[PDB]
Design a protein that fits this description.
Chain D: Pfam families: MRP-S25. Chain D: Belongs to the mitochondrion-specific ribosomal protein mS23 family. Chain D: Keywords: Mitochondrion, Ribonucleoprotein, Ribosomal protein. Chain D: This is Small ribosomal subunit protein mS23. The structure is cut from a larger assembly and holds chains A, B, C, D, E and F. By secondary structure, chain B is mainly alpha-helical. Chain B has 3 helices and no strands. Chain B is extended and about 50 Å long. Chain B starts with 7 loop residues before the first helix and ends with a helix. In chain D, about 45% of the residues lie in helices and about 0% in strands. Chain D has 5 helices and no strands. The chains are: A mainly alpha, B mainly alpha, C alpha+beta, D mainly alpha, E mainly alpha, F mainly alpha. The structure holds potassium ion (8 copies) and magnesium ion (47 copies). The structure holds 4 RNA strands.
Chain lengths: ~130, ~90, ~160, ~220, ~90, ~35
RNA sequence: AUAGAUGAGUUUGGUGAUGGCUCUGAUUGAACACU
RNA sequence: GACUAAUUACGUGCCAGCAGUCGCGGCAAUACGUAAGAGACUAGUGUUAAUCAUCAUAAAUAGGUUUAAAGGGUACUCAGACGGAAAAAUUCGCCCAAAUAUAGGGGACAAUUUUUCUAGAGUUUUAUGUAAGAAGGUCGUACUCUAGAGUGGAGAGAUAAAAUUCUGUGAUACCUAGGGGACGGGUAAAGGCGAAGGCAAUCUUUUAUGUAAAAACUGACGUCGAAGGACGAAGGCAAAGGGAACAAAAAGGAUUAGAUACCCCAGUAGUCUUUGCAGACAAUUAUGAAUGCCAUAGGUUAGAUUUUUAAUUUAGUCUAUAAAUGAAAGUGUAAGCAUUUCACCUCAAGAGUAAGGCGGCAACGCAGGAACUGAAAUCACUAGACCGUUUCUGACACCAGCAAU
RNA sequence: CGCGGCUCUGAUUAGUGUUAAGUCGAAAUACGGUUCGUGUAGUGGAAGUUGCACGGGACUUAUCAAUGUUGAACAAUACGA
RNA sequence: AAUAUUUUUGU
């Protein structure tokens, strides 16, 4: 549990939109036709709700659980088989939304290559 | 129904005590010195930040609790919810 | 969407059924449209938007609401004044017609028939006291207003 | 549905229609009830309509979905906080009986709290101190504690004289041949005797009763 | 610990046996007689004083019935007020 | 469904369960399991 | 096309429901029986 | 005969016959067969068959599923339906408005799309609380086995009563010392936890939701969800362990008219562990999931705030009510007012059956008719009667006594 | 000519419907005289019955050993069922 | 307080 909340601090420090707005070259999606960029108010705190941070936090829970189900006696834990299916499906709905919302922005590619999220994680149907 | 009860248990007990014709004096530690309670020096509740400790001995109505009296749990609640948010 | 008007129809019934003086509704462009039609028809007393608490009843009409910006739009609400007369509510029934699953659109030739107590399409004739509200280009009018303006549109609900 | 259809508010509408025409068609309607014209112009009031009750305190502004919007609110005044402070510092002030039975309701007409604690119509009690404190605290711009001390000391000087009168008034009456009845101290003790005696009867009866239980535990019926 | 609940609506709030049931006193004296015979014996002398008490009991007249208790009447006055109501 | 009517279904399912046992071997000879 | 919307018998010790069946209305490129 | 407009007499006697439905006929039948009268249609009149309507009786308009036919065992989820706020582009959907209308007008709503917004749904800040789940280990009361040629020396256990049975090869009872398996006392509550199934000794390790309070963050990312896949009580199959206790089977002793039974002496699978199959349950709240909304009171669970005494308040759960709703019983955080979406129902019986097929080692499961026979099946309530049903009230009803048969 | 489908028929054999008047028991409805049903696995001429877990459509059908009080004297022009 | 023999049938 200590690593759980320590990793949550790493995800916010790596994929936090307040840190990637300057570490990346083109984080935001490309502007649309007729749309002009305007200044927006500054954030009053760390970005912890963006789909990037959430997808990373779900990747940390999927590894801790999937690793516990593959360990000794992990097959006997038939009640957490649903917990894993709910983390992969919850992550599928954020990747399916962030895909069309980010329109292929650099901030969207930094999350895939860093976490290794391939199309099999959100594109089709996840059947475990 | 109006839940009532006879009040003579305390109503007449006050009339009995007042029939003894004795005042109330500050406690004395064991030269008897019976000092009255209602006096401008001791019987005072209003104060100012100028009065030092030498005048705090006269007051009788304090805002803070008595530490030695509070229980270990009542003391924790005081330290955390009344003292800690005052630094 | 039409789901909001359906919730508004049910709530206004539950409020009248409970004999409540005031009633709150979510502040939306669609709800204000039908509310003005009910008020213009004579079913509700007044419409004033305010915070989560009802305005001062003594100065309801004189109430001066604050501007609606993004800092308070999530808390605004439409406060409607219900009517009760002769030991009977004036807005007893608010049966809807166009539901989220199906939107019913009526023509001018059909509203002219429904306005005189004759069925037409998925609607029924209007009897004494009944009333039908239609959402058209000229706003949320009454079947007799839309018939006068010679327009059709989307049927919202039937009021008794 | 345990209730019944009460149409008490429509007795006129119903009686007015039943008296408009005659059951025997072809004849004029008979005279209506004598009460139909008396309340002709006095309709009933609107009942069963929940309004927004009077708010005796600023309602919670931070609530986004507030409940109990049709619930009467509690009536709290600035004096409630002063009454609790005084009567807690003077608990035995509650033993002094106080009548809450009004005579004609016109008691607050002669109360001028700029004069002092002693007012017309009301007795000198913890309320006079509260009303005097609230005046000084508001008009004279005194603090809660400052006004409390001033109004509290005036209360003591008046109570002291009351206790001194009882002592001197009795001592003064005996110096001229004035005798009195049984004081409260003596009457109180006599009552305890009658009760203590009744307890003694209950103690001796139960004590003897327990002896039988102690002897009945063991068995000695053989009479060895 | 929780406090006593508010009883549901009942048909009648009453106690079955209002007035206590008096136990025959001589039945207790007989038990003492049967105790002597068990330990001492039947044709013995230790049960003399106990057997005599059993004869004197059955000879004495039984007490008179006590006045009935009026508890059930007062329970019926405060039923709807103490409980949730009356059901029928 | 009442209990009286449930007992009607109880007798039907039992007589069938009891029949499929008696004719189990016969249905095995003819390859009708 | 603005007059066009209808019921009845029958389960029960009985009441109220549910749910069938039957009759009431119109008709046939009809058949049969008596005419 | 009634439905259905229109009556008597005689004969017949559950026979002969009548009948669309309910029904009629057992020796004084308005119902059968004659005679007369009466009611009606008319060159037509009846009957049979068929179709529509009756039937909201497959309900798109326009139904319903707590107890009457009918809610799937579960919810994560692909497709698919449905789903906020304030603006804009496009379609010109929708409307004028047709005649399958050229070309336009109106802009509320609708479809695709764009920009913003925070009320929905989510994330962070170790919450508290908690028998969800899993791994590796242990603890204890009782039980049982072995030994101490223990103490003691004739009974014990069983049942309503007994018998089979145990014991002189020393039992039961009372101890000592070694083991051996599974169980979970109190705490404990209308309490709580999980999608459900279900989860209650204890330590360490391990795992996903959820709830309260404030702030911050993302900015409609939402709900439902055929199918597939996963999970799924007890019992069961397969393999290897374990085996104290309980106990289908098999077996014996009693009870009884008979007794496979209920009871008893004993007792194998099985229950437990590990790895698979299996997928049926009163898998229940007889009530799918979810959203919006409707007046109070008394308890209770985990929090929060406070003038922490005692009152507010968020999310649950449980009793009793109002308006209301319902066939009623009753519900009343819903079985109400509405909406979304999936599953399912269309008289009884045959039947959840047959056949072909699919899954499985098997047991069985999924899916799923028709023929034959009917006018009824079915629900809630009301008042009684009954109860090897409770508490009472009368009576030679009984007890007791005497007399008699 | 072969394969597959389809119709009819088949010794023998199974289920179900109907039929007032037969035989054997008495399972359910009351605590139905062993609580009844659901699932599953056995068993018995038959209905039934047995193990295991589960449901109430059965026990909310619940109704005092807290035994129930000298709660401020008395007399007065006060007070007066 | 923890008690429990048996007792079928009715055109
Ligand atoms: K348009
Ligand atoms: K021995
Ligand atoms: K929960
Ligand atoms: K045994
Ligand atoms: K499986
Ligand atoms: K509550
Ligand atoms: K069949
Ligand atoms: K019951
Ligand atoms: Mg296990
Ligand atoms: Mg059913
Ligand atoms: Mg009946
Ligand atoms: Mg019906
Ligand atoms: Mg007639
Ligand atoms: Mg009949
Ligand atoms: Mg005839
Ligand atoms: Mg002709
Ligand atoms: Mg269900
Ligand atoms: Mg299934
Ligand atoms: Mg099922
Ligand atoms: Mg256009
Ligand atoms: Mg934005
Ligand atoms: Mg913001
Ligand atoms: Mg939120
Ligand atoms: Mg914790
Ligand atoms: Mg020996
Ligand atoms: Mg052990
Ligand atoms: Mg359960
Ligand atoms: Mg326990
Ligand atoms: Mg879902
Ligand atoms: Mg599925
Ligand atoms: Mg199993
Ligand atoms: Mg097993
Ligand atoms: Mg085996
Ligand atoms: Mg036997
Ligand atoms: Mg197991
Ligand atoms: Mg279960
Ligand atoms: Mg579902
Ligand atoms: Mg609970
Ligand atoms: Mg309730
Ligand atoms: Mg309803
Ligand atoms: Mg059927
Ligand atoms: Mg099936
Ligand atoms: Mg088959
Ligand atoms: Mg009855
Ligand atoms: Mg006799
Ligand atoms: Mg006799
Ligand atoms: Mg003789
Ligand atoms: Mg043949
Ligand atoms: Mg039985
Ligand atoms: Mg029986
Ligand atoms: Mg039985
Ligand atoms: Mg059973
Ligand atoms: Mg057997
Ligand atoms: Mg029963
Ligand atoms: Mg019979």
């Amino acid at each position: 549990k200590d690593r759980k909340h320590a990793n949550i601090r790493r995800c916010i420090e790596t994929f936090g939109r307040h840190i990637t707005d300057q570490s990346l070259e083109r984080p935001t999606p490309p502007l649309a036709r007729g749309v002009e960029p305007k200044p927006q108010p500054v954030r009053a705190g760390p970005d912890t709700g963006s789909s990037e941070v959430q997808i990373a936090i779900l990747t940390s829970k999927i590894r801790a659980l999937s690793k516990a189900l593959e360990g000794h006696g992990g097959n006997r834990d038939k009640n957490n088989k649903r917990s894993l299916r709910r983390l992969c499906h919850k992550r599928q709905r954020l990747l399916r939304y962030m895909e069309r919302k980010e329109r292929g922005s650099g901030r969207w590619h930094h999350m895939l290559e860093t976490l290794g999220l391939t199309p099999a994680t959100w594109k089709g149907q996840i059947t475990l | 129904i109006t839940d009532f009860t006879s009040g003579t248990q305390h109503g007449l007990t006050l009339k009995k005590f007042q029939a003894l014709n004795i005042p109330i004096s500050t406690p004395s530690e064991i030269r008897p010195v019976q000092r009255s309670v209602f006096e401008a020096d001791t019987d005072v509740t209003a104060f100012s930040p100028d009065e030092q400790i030498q005048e705090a001995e006269k007051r009788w109505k304090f805002s803070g609790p008595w530490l030695a009296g509070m229980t270990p749990g009542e003391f924790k609640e005081y330290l955390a919810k009344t003292v800690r948010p005052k630094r | 969407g039409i789901q909001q008007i359906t919730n508004m129809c049910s709530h206004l019934q539950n409020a009248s059924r409970a004999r409540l003086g005031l009633t709150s509704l979510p502040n939306t462009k669609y709800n204000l449209a039908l509310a003005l039609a009910l008020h213009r028809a004579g079913f509700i007393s007044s419409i004033t938007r305010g915070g989560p608490h009802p305005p001062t009843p003594e100065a309801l009409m004189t109430y001066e609401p604050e501007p609606v910006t993004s800092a308070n739009v999530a808390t605004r609400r439409l406060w409607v004044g219900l009517k009760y007369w002769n030991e009977e509510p004036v807005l007893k029934e608010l049966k809807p017609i166009s539901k989220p699953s199906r939107l019913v659109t009526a023509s001018l030739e059909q509203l002219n028939r429904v306005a005189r107590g004759f069925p037409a399409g998925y609607m029924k004739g209007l009897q004494l006291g009944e009333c039908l509200f239609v959402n058209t280009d000229r706003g949320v009018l009454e079947v007799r207003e839309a018939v006068e303006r010679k327009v059709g549109g989307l049927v919202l609900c039937k009021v008794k | 549905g345990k209730g019944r259809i009460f149409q008490a508010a429509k007795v006129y509408q119903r009686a007015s229609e039943a008296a408009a025409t005659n059951i025997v068609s072809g004849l004029p309607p008979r005279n209506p009830p004598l009460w139909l014209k008396a309340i002709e112009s006095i309709p009933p009031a609107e009942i069963n309509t929940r309004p927004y009750p009077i708010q005796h305190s600023p309602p919670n502004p931070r609530a986004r979905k507030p409940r109990n919007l049709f619930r009467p609110t509690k009536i709290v005044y600035p004096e409630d906080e002063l009454r609790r402070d005084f009567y807690r510092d003077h608990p035995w002030e509650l033993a002094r009986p106080r009548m809450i039975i009004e005579l004609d309701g016109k008691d607050a007409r002669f109360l001028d709290w700029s004069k002092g604690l002693r007012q017309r119509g009301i007795p000198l009690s913890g309320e006079s101190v509260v009303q005097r404190q609230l005046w000084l605290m508001e008009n004279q711009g005194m603090t809660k504690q400052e006004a409390y001390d001033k109004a509290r000391h005036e209360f003591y000087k008046l109570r002291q004289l009351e206790q001194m009168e009882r002592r001197i008034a009795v001592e003064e009456a005996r110096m001229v041949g004035g005798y009195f009845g049984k004081d409260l101290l003596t009457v109180g003790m006599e009552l305890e005797n009658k009760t203590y005696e009744s307890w003694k009867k209950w103690a001796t009866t139960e004590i003897a009763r327990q002896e039988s239980a102690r002897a009945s535990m063991y068995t000695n019926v053989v009479d060895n | 610990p929780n406090k006593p609940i508010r009883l549901p609506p009942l048909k009648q709030l009453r106690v079955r046996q209002a007035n206590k049931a008096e136990e025959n006193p001589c039945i207790a004296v007989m038990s003492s007689v049967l105790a002597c015979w068990a330990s001492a014996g039947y044709n013995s002398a230790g049960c003399a004083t106990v057997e005599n008490a059993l004869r004197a009991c059955m000879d004495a007249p039984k007490p008179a019935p006590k006045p009935n208790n009026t508890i059930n009447y007062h329970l019926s006055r405060f039923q709807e007020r103490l409980t949730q109501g009356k059901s029928k | 469904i009442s209990v009286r009517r449930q007992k009607k279904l109880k007798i039907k399912k039992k007589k069938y369960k009891k029949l499929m046992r008696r004719t189990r071997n016969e249905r095995r000879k003819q390859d009708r399991l």
